[PDB]
DNA sequence: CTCAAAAAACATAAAATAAC
DNA sequence: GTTATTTTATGTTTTTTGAG
């Protein structure tokens, strides 16, 4: 299933692709961690998603063992791919001590 | 009963690691 | 000998703590 984010990007969590509606040729290939983060965020729009939840969805439920630092690094890479600025975000907002929150519109 | 300083939490820049 | 993923080093922001 595809998601349209902030009426700007088309995200496909199955192919792991991000496409900016300004482009006819460019397909952004998201890394696995960035895609899975964006998928869980888009399935729960505007919810504060805990770090544990993202850690579990993205790594643990698939047997992968990584430090919490991997979440924070993957968020930073994703924000870069979305051209999302850390304050003031348009896509992913940090909620300190509680996780992250997708504030972009999600249309499915 | 506040607000500075200390500690914790999060972000980005580099490096390390692993496996094509 | 190159690239994805993870981790480490350094930087920035937020929160907790407690003395005045």
Swiss-Prot record:
It comes from the Bacteria. It is found in: Cell membrane. Residues 2-104 bind DNA. This transcription activator controls cholera toxin, pilus colonization factor and outer membrane protein expression in V.cholerae. It binds to the 5'-TTTTGAT-3' tandemly repeated DNA sequence in the cholera toxin promoter region. ToxS interacts with the C-terminal periplasmic domain of ToxR, stimulating its activity. It activates transcription at the promoters for tcpI and tcpA and this is presumably via ToxT. This is Cholera toxin transcriptional activator. It comes from Vibrio cholerae serotype O1 (strain ATCC 39315 / El Tor Inaba N16961). The chain holds residues 19 to 125 of 294 of the full protein.
């Amino acid at each position: 299933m595809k998601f349209i984010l902030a009426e700007k990007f088309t995200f496909d969590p199955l192919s792991n692709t991000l496409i900016d509606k300004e482009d006819s040729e460019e397909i952004i290939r998201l890394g696995s961690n960035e895609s899975r983060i964006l998928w869980l965020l888009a399935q729960r729009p505007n919810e504060v998603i805990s770090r544990n939840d993202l850690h579990d969805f993205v790594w643990r439920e698939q047997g992968f063992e990584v430090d919490d630092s991997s979440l924070t690094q993957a968020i930073s890479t994703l924000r870069k791919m979305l051209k999302d600025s850390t304050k003031s975000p348009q896509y992913v907002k940090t909620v300190p001590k509680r996780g992250y929150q997708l504030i972009a519109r999600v249309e499915t």
